[PDB]
Design a protein around this ligand. Structure first.
Ligand code: FAD
Ligand code: CL
Length: 385
């Protein structure tokens, strides 16, 4: 016997941010999650997340990256939880052989971002612990950095609840009942109604959006990361070792400097096992590529951080065909908002997306230009049942 103004299904990276934005405006919101955010079953754990401004995936992402950065700084001031550390982010690759590096440089240029350009030995000299061939070039962004993702969701939740938002945990939404003037969700713990619905179930979007008559290609991928014992005199955040995302002949890798001696963290971005969020094996090391792919990179580019494995984590990417996000209203229901397919690089934007989702749910529009994330774009191959 309780109606809400807005219901958010999937209170993760995007959903909890949306809940915070809605709650702050006095909007009666209900957030429902299959677990208890932040948790280790979705796509937000692993402790840290890189945030970049100069965007190699496309310069059209810069505006939202900058707005998100400002929002992260605001969150830092609103909670006791640590939110962001300005490690700066280094991007490098073979000269003339990386579209990612090239677009990163062009994005910085087009938006007048503050960055350093260096190559060959200059990279090795500036950052002891990095060893790249002389034919490698790079762009360093000193003002971007590292976000503590679990703290972000935890802070957004605590703030949202303090303002009246209700969070229903360990409740898996199984179906949706949408009408022209209301929305209703079904769960093992009961049904709820509201005026608007926000759908942000991460990897599970690939299995439940069909319940909304949507047939959009979304592939979940098993993506691991490892923390390795490193030479702290070189890889510690304290000695300014940067966060990074680089492209080498065999793919794209990303990493973080050691924080308080937790060890350098590394991940392989271009490769992962195709999986189902309900049957994925979340144990690190069950595939010999888990650890081998990482050490193959370390022994060649950051030899001093190829020590004993301290910790491992298994997480998920949810890719769209063009690897661009999906942030839009449901084509058949203006009272339903969709957030999906962040394709492995959406957390840094979660703060900004929360704001966008709030605007879409309340007004059906947003001040941000989200055209590249249209649910109707061709490269997506979207359709109905
Ligand atoms: C996996 C990964 C991703 C990643 C990364 C490293 C790894 C190993 N590093 C990143 C980085 O350095 N910078 C960056 O910008 N992004 C990076 N990423 C990607 C980012 O983490 C993902 O894009 C992001 O987390 C996507 O957010 P989203 O909100 O989509 O996913 P979620 O956080 O998993 O939240 C979904 C929630 O919904 C719930 N759920 C699922 N099904 C249901 C049902 N049926 N009912 C109710 N709730 C449901 C989940 O429980 C989850 O909490
Ligand atoms: Cl993702």
């Amino acid at each position: 016997s309780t109606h809400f103004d807005v219901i958010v299904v999937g209170a993760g990276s995007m959903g909890m941010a949306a809940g915070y934005q809605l709650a702050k405006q006095g909007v009666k919101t209900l957030l429902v999650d299959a677990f208890d955010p932040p948790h280790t079953n979705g796509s937000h754990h692993g402790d840290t997340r890189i945030i970049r401004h100069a965007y190699g995936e496309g310069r059209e992402y810069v505006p939202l990256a900058l707005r998100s950065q400002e929002l992260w700084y605001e969150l830092e001031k609103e909670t006791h939880h640590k939110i962001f550390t300005k490690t700066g982010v280094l991007v490098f690759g073979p000269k003339g052989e990386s579209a990612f590096v090239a677009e990163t440089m062009e994005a910085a240029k087009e938006h007048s971002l503050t960055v350093d350009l260096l190559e060959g030995d200059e990279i090795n000299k500036r950052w002891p612990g990095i060893t790249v061939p002389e034919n490698y070039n790079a762009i360093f962004e000193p003002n971007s950095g590292v976000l503590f993702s679990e703290n972000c969701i935890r802070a957004y939740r605590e703030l949202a609840e303090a303002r009246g938002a209700k969070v229903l945990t360990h409740t898996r939404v199984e179906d949706f009942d949408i009408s022209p003037d209301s929305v209703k969700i079904e769960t093992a713990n009961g049904s709820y109604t509201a005026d608007k619905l926000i759908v942000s179930m991460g990897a599970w979007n690939s299995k439940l959006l069909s319940k909304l008559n949507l047939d959009i290609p979304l592939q979940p991928y098993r993506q691991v990361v490892g923390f390795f014992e490193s030479d702290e005199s070189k890889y510690s955040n304290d000695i300014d070792f940067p966060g990074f995302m680089v492209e080498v002949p065999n793919g794209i890798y990303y990493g973080f400097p050691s924080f308080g001696g937790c060890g350098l963290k590394l991940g392989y971005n271009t490769f992962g096992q195709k999986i189902d969020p309900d049957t994925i094996n979340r144990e690190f090391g069950v595939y010999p590529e888990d650890e081998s792919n990482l050490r193959a990179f370390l022994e060649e580019y950051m030899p001093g951080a190829n020590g004993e494995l301290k910790r491992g984590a298994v997480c998920m990417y949810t890719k769209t065909l063009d690897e661009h996000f999906i942030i839009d209203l449901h084509p058949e229901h203006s009272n339903v908002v969709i957030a999906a397919g962040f394709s492995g690089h959406g957390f840094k934007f979660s703060s900004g997306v929360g704001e966008v989702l709030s605007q879409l749910a309340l007004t059906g529009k947003t001040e941000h230009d989200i055209s590249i994330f249209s649910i109707n774009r061709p490269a997506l191959k979207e359709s109905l049942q």
